RNA sequence: CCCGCAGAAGAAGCACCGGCUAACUCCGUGCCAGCAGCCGCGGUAAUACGGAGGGUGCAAGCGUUAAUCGGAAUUACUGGGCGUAAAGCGCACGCAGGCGGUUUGUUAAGUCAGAUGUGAAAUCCCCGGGCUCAACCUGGGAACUGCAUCUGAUACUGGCAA
RNA sequence: UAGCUAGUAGGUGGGGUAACGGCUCACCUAGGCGACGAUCCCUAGCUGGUCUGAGAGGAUGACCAGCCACACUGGAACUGA
C-alpha cells in the first residue's frame, strides 16, 4: 500500500526528469509542500502550485537546464523502515557542499547549509544531489 | 538483508578452522616418529617423497614431511614438527624442522641454509 | 646500521648521481654511471610500477643515508603532521644533523658529516650532539668543537662547499666555521627531481 | 604533453580450422595532464602493431574532465559492466591511491591526491570504462551554480 | 520532583502485588532501527487497587520482597 | 586514614612523583581519591620542578588527612609562593 | 656525564632473484634428486632443483612457523545478492511482529538544542617541556562517540481527541 | 536444549541481620519465570584498554590500573571495625 508519500514524490520527480517530462503532479500534503518549497527555493525545480480543494493536487513545474536535467540523483534517506536523525555535528553535506540534504528541524523543514547554521540538527528527509 | 531480518537474525560469517591441528596452536610441537617412509605424489608430479609418521606429545598421530636432500631419521629419533602443508603428497600437513632436536642438517647446503638447518661454514 | 659498501653502485643503481662520492674531483669520470649496477646491468630493466616506486623510496634513503624502519618512522612523523606529507617528509630529511653538517660544507660528503657528527666534533647551540638524526630546529647555531678545528678534512670540505649551490636556509659562514639553520626548507628550495608522492604511494599501500 | 601509458597486454585466441591463431591485445589511455582523459583498446597480431592501435584510437575519443586544484572535486562513483569504483576528492590527500589500471588513468588524467577503492569486478577494460564515467559525470561548483540559477 | 515509569499491568493474581510492563523505544546499536523493548517488573500496591490491563506509574522504593523494589504512585487509564 | 603522598610514576632513575590523596591502605601507585600536584626531583633547573593545588590541600587537611613527610616538605618549600 | 691515551685498529649477517614480487647468467642433475604460499617447475641445452658468479631486500638482525585483523563489498549497518551463476516457501488465510493516506488541536515519549552531574588515572590524539636525539618520561587540553536529570523547540515519528 | 519453578511467587505474623529482603519459620493465597529465549549444555574472570581497520566493525583483554573470585581439596565458624 502507500507507505511512504514523501518517497512517492521524489520517485514523480526521478522519473519526469528521466523522461523529460514538463511538469509534476501529485497529491499534496504538509510536508510535501514544505519539500517542495526548499526546492524551488534551492533551484531544484522551477516552480510548485497546490490546487483542489476537497483533494489537493501539488504540482512541480520541473528544471532542465541544458538538453541534461537539473535533478541529477534525488535519494529518500529516511525511510519509514529505518528512520534517521542527525544531530547538528553530524549533519552531512552532500556532494561535498554541491547538493542540499533536505533535513526536517523542529524550526522547520531546512536545507542542511541552513539547519547547520541555525545550529540544530533533525531527521534526513532525502539528498539532492 | 531486510534489517528487521536482521534484528531478528545476525549476520554470522563461519570459523573456518586450522589446517594444522598442532593443538592449542604452538608454533612447533615435538614426536617420536614412529616410522619412516617414502610415498609417491599425486598425478602431475612424480618423485618419492621422505615423509615420517609421527606421535606428538599431546597425543595426536600425524604424518609429517622432511625437506631437503638427505635425512637420518629412524623411528625413535625426537623430532620437531613445523606446521606447512606439502600439496603435493595426500594428506601431509606439517613439516620438520631440520636442525632440531634428533634431525640433523642438510649435508654440504650453502644457499638458503637457515631454513635447513645447517650452520655458517668458515671461511 | 649503516650502509659500509661500495657507494658509487648505489648510484648507478639509480641512474642518477646520489652525490655519494662529492669529495676532490668533479663530475664522475670513473664510475661507468648508466652502464652496469651488475653483471647484466647493460640490460635495460623495463621496469614495473612497484619497481619505480621502490626504486624512488631507495633513491631517496640512499641520497640521505637512512636504514628502512627509521625511513618508515620519518613518513609516520610526516604523515601525522599537518600539511603534505611528501614536503613534510623531506623536512623532516634535511632536519637531520649530519644533513646540515653537510649543507653548510663542514663535510665533503654525508658520511663524512656523519662522522664528523659521530666523532663529537660538532656542536649545536653550545652542546655537543654526538647523533646523526638530531632533528635541528630553525634558528639554531651548529659548529664544529674546538678540537676538530682546522682539520684538514672541514677545510677541504669548505673548498669544495663553494662549487655547489649555497641553500637558502643557512648561514653558512665558514669564517668562524658556524652556522644557523634559519628556517625549513621549502620544497622548492631543494633538488627539484625526487618525486615524493611515489614514496607516499609506496607506504600507503 | 600527451603523456601517453599502456595499461594491459593480453593473448587473446580464435581457433580456426587447423589450431589456434593467437592475437594481442592492448588497453592504453593518454590524457594531457589537465582534464583530458582518453583510453583505447585496439587489438592486433603483434604486440606493437596493438599499442599503436590502441594510442591512435586513444588519441581521439578522448573527455574533459572538470578538475579542481589539482584533484577531483566531490565524492563520485562510476560503475560499468560488473566494475564498480568509488573515488573520493582527498582535498591534497597526497598521492594518487588508486588500484591498479586506476592510478593510470587517474595519473594522466591530471588529478594527482584522490582516494579509490574499486569494487566489484577489476577487470582492466571494465576499469578504466568505470572511472571514465565517474570522472565525466562529476561537476564543478560552477556547472552546478549554473544549472541551479545560483 | 521523584523519578517514576509508566507501564501497563500485565497480570494480577497476587495478594497485594502486582506486575508491571514497561516499554522502552530503543535504537538498534549496529542498524539504526528503533525497536520497542520490555521490562516486566513486580510492582507494590497496598490494598491492590489496579486491575489486569491498565495504565499506572511507579516509583522505586527498598526492597519489599524477592525482586519487588517498586511501588505504585498513580494508576491511570483503567479501561476496558 | 586518607593520605597525601607521593606516588612514584617515571622511568628507571628518573622518578616523576605525583602527589596524590588515596586512602591509606592501597598501593602506592594504586588507586586514588584524587591527584593534587606533581613532584620532579630534577625536571632541570628551568621554573618549577613541582606544582601543588594548595587549594584542594587544604580542603583535604580539612577533611582529617594525613600528610606524609615529603608533601608536608613540598608545602614547607613552595610556602605560599616561594 | 666530562677529559686524556693508543691505533682503523675489537665489531655483518639473513632471506630472495619464473609470475604475483625488487633482482640474471653459467655449471651439475635429467619425472631423479628435489622445490612450492598459489599458479606450478624437474622426463639433456632448468632465469623455478643443487652449487657458483652477479644482483635485489632488510640489517644486529634476518627467515620460517603459530595466531589475529586487513585485503575479503567472501555475512554487505556503513556496504551484496535471489529469471538462467547459490538463493522466491507449492499456494493462500491469519495471530504476535514490522509498516501505515489526509486535516486540525493537545502532549513531547522518540527527535533536536542548551545546561548540570558523571564518564577514575594511565593509553590514543593535539600543543608544549626533560632525558645529547629517539624510544621513554611528563605539563595542559581535546577525547571518552555514553548515561541520568533539568530547561526549552515542536518540523517529522509516536500517544490522545476530533 | 521449550518448558522451568513448592521457599517456588506474593501476603500476614514471629524470629534474624549493622541494614531492606523467603534471609528464616508458621499459616494463608496459587502464583512466578519463558520464544524480548526461561531452563539445560559448551565456553569464559570483567573493565580502562591492546592489535587490526579509512571507518563502521572484527579479534583480544599479556605488562600497567579499577572491580570480582580463589589460597592443597570439601565444609565450618572464632577473634575482630
Given at each position: 500500500?502507500?507507505?511512504?508519500?514523501?518517497?512517492?514524490?521524489?520517485?514523480?520527480?526521478?522519473?519526469?526528469?528521466?523522461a523529460?517530462?514538463?511538469?509534476?503532479?501529485?497529491?499534496?500534503?504538509?510536508?510535501?509542500?514544505?519539500?517542495?518549497?526548499?526546492?524551488?527555493?534551492?533551484?531544484?525545480?522551477?516552480?510548485?502550485?497546490?490546487?483542489?480543494?476537497?483533494?489537493?493536487?501539488?504540482?512541480?513545474?520541473?528544471?532542465?537546464?541544458?538538453?541534461?536535467?537539473?535533478?541529477?540523483?534525488?535519494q529518500?534517506?529516511?525511510?519509514?523502515?529505518?528512520?534517521?536523525?542527525?544531530?547538528?555535528?553530524?549533519?552531512?553535506?552532500?556532494?561535498?557542499?554541491?547538493?542540499?540534504?533536505?533535513?526536517?528541524?523542529?524550526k522547520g523543514?531546512?536545507?542542511?547549509?541552513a539547519?547547520?547554521?541555525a545550529?540544530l540538527?533533525?531527521?534526513?528527509?532525502?539528498?539532492?544531489? | 538483508?531486510?534489517?528487521?531480518?536482521?534484528?531478528?537474525?545476525?549476520?554470522?560469517?563461519?570459523?573456518?578452522?586450522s589446517?594444522?591441528?598442532?593443538?592449542?596452536?604452538?608454533?612447533?610441537?615435538?614426536?617420536?616418529?614412529?616410522?619412516?617412509?617414502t610415498?609417491?605424489p599425486?598425478?602431475?608430479?612424480?618423485?618419492?617423497?621422505?615423509?615420517?609418521?609421527?606421535?606428538?606429545?599431546?597425543?595426536?598421530?600425524?604424518?609429517?614431511?622432511?625437506?631437503?636432500?638427505?635425512?637420518?631419521?629412524?623411528?625413535?629419533?625426537?623430532?620437531?614438527?613445523?606446521?606447512?602443508?606439502?600439496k603435493?603428497?595426500?594428506?601431509?600437513?606439517?613439516?620438520?624442522?631440520?636442525?632440531?632436536?634428533?634431525?640433523?642438517?642438510?649435508?654440504?647446503?650453502?644457499?638458503?641454509?637457515?631454513?635447513?638447518?645447517?650452520?655458517?661454514?668458515?671461511? | 646500521?649503516?650502509?659500509?659498501?661500495?657507494?658509487?653502485?648505489?648510484?648507478?643503481?639509480?641512474?642518477?648521481?646520489?652525490?655519494?662520492?662529492?669529495?676532490?674531483?668533479?663530475?664522475?669520470?670513473?664510475?661507468?654511471?648508466?652502464?652496469?649496477?651488475?653483471?647484466?646491468?647493460?640490460?635495460?630493466?623495463?621496469?614495473?610500477?612497484?619497481?619505480?616506486?621502490?626504486?624512488?623510496?631507495?633513491?631517496?634513503r640512499?641520497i640521505?643515508?637512512?636504514?628502512?624502519?627509521?625511513?618508515?618512522?620519518?613518513?609516520?612523523?610526516?604523515?601525522?603532521?599537518?600539511?603534505?606529507?611528501?614536503?613534510?617528509?623531506?623536512?623532516?630529511?634535511?632536519?637531520?644533523?649530519?644533513?646540515?653538517?653537510?649543507?653548510?660544507?663542514?663535510?665533503?660528503?654525508?658520511?663524512?658529516?656523519?662522522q664528523?657528527?659521530?666523532?663529537?666534533?660538532?656542536?649545536?647551540?653550545?652542546?655537543?650532539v654526538?647523533?646523526?638524526?638530531?632533528?635541528?630546529?630553525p634558528?639554531?647555531?651548529?659548529?664544529?668543537?674546538?678540537?676538530?678545528?682546522?682539520?684538514?678534512?672541514?677545510?677541504?670540505?669548505?673548498?669544495?662547499?663553494?662549487?655547489?649551490?649555497?641553500?637558502?636556509?643557512?648561514?653558512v659562514?665558514?669564517?668562524?666555521?658556524?652556522?644557523?639553520?634559519?628556517?625549513?626548507?621549502?620544497?622548492?628550495?631543494?633538488?627539484?627531481?625526487?618525486?615524493?608522492?611515489?614514496?607516499?604511494?609506496?607506504?600507503?599501500? | 604533453?600527451?603523456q601517453?601509458?599502456?595499461?594491459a597486454?593480453?593473448?587473446?585466441?580464435?581457433?580456426?580450422?587447423?589450431?589456434?591463431?593467437?592475437?594481442?591485445?592492448?588497453?592504453?589511455?593518454?590524457?594531457?595532464?589537465?582534464?583530458?582523459?582518453?583510453?583505447?583498446?585496439?587489438?592486433?597480431?603483434?604486440?606493437?602493431?596493438?599499442?599503436?592501435?590502441?594510442?591512435?584510437?586513444?588519441?581521439?575519443?578522448?573527455?574533459?574532465?572538470?578538475?579542481?586544484?589539482?584533484?577531483?572535486?566531490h565524492?563520485?562513483?562510476?560503475?560499468?559492466?560488473?566494475?564498480?569504483?568509488?573515488?573520493?576528492?582527498?582535498?591534497?590527500?597526497?598521492?594518487?591511491?588508486?588500484?591498479?589500471?586506476?592510478?593510470?588513468?587517474?595519473?594522466?588524467?591530471?588529478?594527482?591526491?584522490?582516494?579509490?577503492?574499486?569494487?566489484?569486478?577489476?577487470?582492466?577494460?571494465?576499469?578504466?570504462?568505470?572511472?571514465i564515467?565517474?570522472?565525466?559525470?562529476?561537476?564543478?561548483?560552477?556547472?552546478?551554480?549554473?544549472?541551479?540559477?545560483? | 520532583?521523584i523519578?517514576?515509569?509508566?507501564?501497563?499491568?500485565?497480570?494480577?493474581?497476587?495478594?497485594?502485588?502486582?506486575?508491571?510492563?514497561?516499554?522502552?523505544?530503543?535504537?538498534?546499536?549496529?542498524?539504526?532501527?528503533?525497536?520497542?523493548?520490555?521490562?516486566?517488573?513486580?510492582?507494590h500496591?497496598?490494598?491492590?487497587?489496579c486491575?489486569?490491563?491498565?495504565?499506572?506509574?511507579?516509583?522505586?522504593?527498598?526492597?519489599?520482597?524477592?525482586?519487588?523494589?517498586?511501588?505504585?504512585?498513580?494508576?491511570?487509564?483503567?479501561?476496558? | 586514614?586518607?593520605?597525601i603522598?607521593?606516588?612514584?610514576?617515571?622511568?628507571?632513575?628518573?622518578?616523576?612523583?605525583?602527589?596524590?590523596?588515596?586512602?591509606?591502605?592501597?598501593?602506592?601507585?594504586?588507586?586514588?581519591?584524587?591527584?593534587?600536584?606533581?613532584?620532579?626531583?630534577?625536571?632541570?633547573?628551568?621554573?618549577?620542578?613541582?606544582?601543588?593545588?594548595?587549594?584542594?590541600?587544604?580542603?583535604?587537611?580539612?577533611?582529617?588527612?594525613?600528610?606524609?613527610?615529603?608533601?608536608?616538605?613540598?608545602?614547607?618549600?613552595?610556602?605560599?609562593?616561594?
Amino acid at each position: 500500500s502507500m507507505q511512504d508519500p514523501i518517497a512517492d514524490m521524489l520517485t514523480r520527480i526521478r522519473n519526469g526528469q528521466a523522461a523529460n517530462k514538463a511538469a509534476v503532479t501529485m497529491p499534496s500534503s504538509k510536508l510535501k509542500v514544505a519539500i517542495a518549497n526548499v526546492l524551488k527555493e534551492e533551484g531544484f525545480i522551477e516552480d510548485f502550485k497546490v490546487e483542489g480543494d476537497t483533494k489537493p493536487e501539488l504540482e512541480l513545474t520541473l528544471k532542465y537546464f541544458q538538453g541534461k536535467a537539473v535533478v541529477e540523483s534525488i535519494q529518500r534517506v529516511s525511510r519509514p523502515g529505518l528512520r534517521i536523525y542527525k544531530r547538528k555535528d553530524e549533519l552531512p553535506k552532500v556532494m561535498a557542499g554541491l547538493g542540499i540534504a533536505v533535513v526536517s528541524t523542529s524550526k522547520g523543514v531546512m536545507t542542511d547549509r541552513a539547519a547547520r547554521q541555525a545550529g540544530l540538527g533533525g531527521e534526513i528527509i532525502c539528498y539532492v544531489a | 538483508a531486510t534489517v528487521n531480518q536482521l534484528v531478528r537474525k545476525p549476520r554470522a560469517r563461519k570459523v573456518a578452522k586450522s589446517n594444522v591441528p598442532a593443538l592449542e596452536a604452538c608454533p612447533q610441537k615435538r614426536g617420536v616418529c614412529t616410522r619412516v617412509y617414502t610415498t609417491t605424489p599425486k598425478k602431475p608430479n612424480s618423485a618419492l617423497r621422505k615423509v615420517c609418521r609421527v606421535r606428538l606429545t599431546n597425543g595426536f598421530e600425524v604424518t609429517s614431511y622432511i625437506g631437503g636432500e638427505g635425512h637420518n631419521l629412524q623411528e625413535h629419533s625426537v623430532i620437531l614438527i613445523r606446521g606447512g602443508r606439502v600439496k603435493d603428497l595426500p594428506g601431509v600437513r606439517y613439516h620438520t624442522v631440520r636442525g632440531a632436536l634428533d634431525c640433523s642438517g642438510v649435508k654440504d647446503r650453502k644457499q638458503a641454509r637457515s631454513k635447513y638447518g645447517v650452520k655458517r661454514p668458515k671461511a | 646500521a649503516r650502509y659500509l659498501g661500495p657507494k658509487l653502485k648505489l648510484s648507478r643503481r639509480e641512474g642518477t648521481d646520489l652525490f655519494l662520492k662529492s669529495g676532490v674531483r668533479a663530475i664522475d669520470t670513473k664510475c661507468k654511471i648508466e652502464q652496469a649496477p651488475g653483471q647484466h646491468g647493460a640490460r635495460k630493466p623495463r621496469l614495473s610500477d612497484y619497481g619505480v616506486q621502490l626504486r624512488e623510496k631507495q633513491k631517496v634513503r640512499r641520497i640521505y643515508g637512512v636504514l628502512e624502519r627509521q625511513f618508515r618512522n620519518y613518513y609516520k612523523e610526516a604523515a601525522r603532521l599537518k600539511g603534505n606529507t611528501g614536503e613534510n617528509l623531506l623536512a623532516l630529511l634535511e632536519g637531520r644533523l649530519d644533513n646540515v653538517v653537510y649543507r653548510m660544507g663542514f663535510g665533503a660528503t654525508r658520511a663524512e658529516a656523519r662522522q664528523l657528527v659521530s666523532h663529537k666534533a660538532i656542536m649545536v647551540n653550545g652542546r655537543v650532539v654526538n647523533i646523526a638524526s638530531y632533528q635541528v630546529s630553525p634558528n639554531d647555531v651548529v659548529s664544529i668543537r674546538e678540537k676538530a678545528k682546522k682539520q684538514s678534512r672541514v677545510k677541504a670540505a669548505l673548498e669544495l662547499a663553494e662549487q655547489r649551490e649555497k641553500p637558502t636556509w643557512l648561514e653558512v659562514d665558514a669564517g668562524k666555521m658556524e652556522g644557523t639553520f634559519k628556517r625549513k626548507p621549502e620544497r622548492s628550495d631543494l633538488s627539484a627531481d625526487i618525486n615524493e608522492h611515489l614514496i607516499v604511494e609506496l607506504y600507503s599501500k | 604533453e600527451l603523456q601517453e601509458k599502456l595499461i594491459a597486454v593480453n593473448r587473446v585466441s580464435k581457433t580456426v580450422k587447423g589450431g589456434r591463431i593467437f592475437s594481442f591485445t592492448a588497453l592504453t589511455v593518454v590524457g594531457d595532464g589537465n582534464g583530458r582523459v582518453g583510453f583505447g583498446y585496439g587489438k592486433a597480431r603483434e604486440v606493437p602493431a596493438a599499442i599503436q592501435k590502441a594510442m591512435e584510437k586513444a588519441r581521439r575519443n578522448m573527455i574533459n574532465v572538470a578538475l579542481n586544484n589539482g584533484t577531483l572535486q566531490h565524492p563520485v562513483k562510476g560503475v560499468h559492466t560488473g566494475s564498480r569504483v568509488f573515488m573520493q576528492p582527498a582535498s591534497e590527500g597526497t598521492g594518487i591511491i588508486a588500484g591498479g589500471a586506476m592510478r593510470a588513468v587517474l595519473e594522466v588524467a591530471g588529478v594527482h591526491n584522490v582516494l579509490a577503492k574499486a569494487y566489484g569486478s577489476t577487470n582492466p577494460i571494465n576499469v578504466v570504462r568505470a572511472t571514465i564515467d565517474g570522472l565525466e559525470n562529476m561537476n564543478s561548483p560552477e556547472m552546478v551554480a549554473a544549472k541551479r540559477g545560483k | 520532583k521523584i523519578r517514576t515509569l509508566q507501564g501497563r499491568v500485565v497480570s494480577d493474581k497476587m495478594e497485594k502485588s502486582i506486575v508491571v510492563a514497561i516499554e522502552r523505544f530503543v535504537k538498534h546499536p549496529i542498524y539504526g532501527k528503533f525497536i520497542k523493548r520490555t521490562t516486566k517488573l513486580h510492582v507494590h500496591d497496598e490494598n491492590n487497587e489496579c486491575g489486569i490491563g491498565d495504565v499506572v506509574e511507579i516509583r522505586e522504593c527498598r526492597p519489599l520482597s524477592k525482586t519487588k523494589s517498586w511501588t505504585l504512585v498513580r494508576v491511570v487509564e483503567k479501561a476496558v | 586514614m586518607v593520605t597525601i603522598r607521593l606516588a612514584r610514576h617515571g622511568a628507571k632513575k628518573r622518578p616523576f612523583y605525583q602527589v596524590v590523596v588515596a586512602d591509606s591502605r592501597n598501593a602506592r601507585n594504586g588507586r586514588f581519591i584524587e591527584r593534587v600536584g606533581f613532584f620532579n626531583p630534577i625536571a632541570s633547573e628551568k621554573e618549577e620542578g613541582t606544582r601543588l593545588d594548595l587549594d584542594r590541600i587544604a580542603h583535604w587537611v580539612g577533611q582529617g588527612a594525613t600528610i606524609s613527610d615529603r608533601v608536608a616538605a613540598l608545602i614547607k618549600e613552595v610556602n605560599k609562593a616561594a
